[PDB]
C-alpha cells in the first residue's frame, strides 16, 4: 500500500509524483 519512492524510484506510482 505504501511505496517508498526513496527506494522504489521505478515504481509506476512514484512516476505520478515524478513530475
UniProtKB/Swiss-Prot annotation:
Q: Please name every pair of cysteines joined by a disulfide bond in this record.
A: 5-14
Q: Which domain of life is it from?
A: Eukaryota
Where can this protein be found?
Secreted
In what tissue types does this protein appear?
Expressed by the venom duct.
Protein family: Belongs to the elevenin family.
Q: Quaternary form?
A: Monomer.
Q: Quote the record's miscellaneous comment.
A: Negative results: has no effect on six different human nAChR subtypes including alpha-1-beta-1-epsilon-delta-epsilon/CHRNA1-CHRNB1-CHRND-CHRNE, alpha-3-beta-2/CHRNA3-CHRNB2, alpha-3-beta-4/CHRNA3-CHRNB4, alpha-4-beta-2/CHRNA4-CHRNB2, alpha-7/CHRNA7 and alpha-9-alpha-10/CHRNA9-CHRNA10, when tested at 1 uM.
Q: What is known of its domains?
A: The cysteine framework is C-C.
The job of this chain, per UniProt, is described as:
May mimic the function of prey elevenin neuropeptide. In vivo, intracranial injection in mice induces hyperactivity (tested at 5 and 10 nM).
Protein name, entry field: Elevenin-Vc1
Classification from the root reads: Eukaryota, Metazoa, Spiralia, Lophotrochozoa, Mollusca
Amino acid at each position: 500500500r505504501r511505496i517508498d519512492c526513496k527506494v522504489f524510484v521505478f515504481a509506476p506510482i512514484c512516476r505520478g509524483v515524478a513530475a
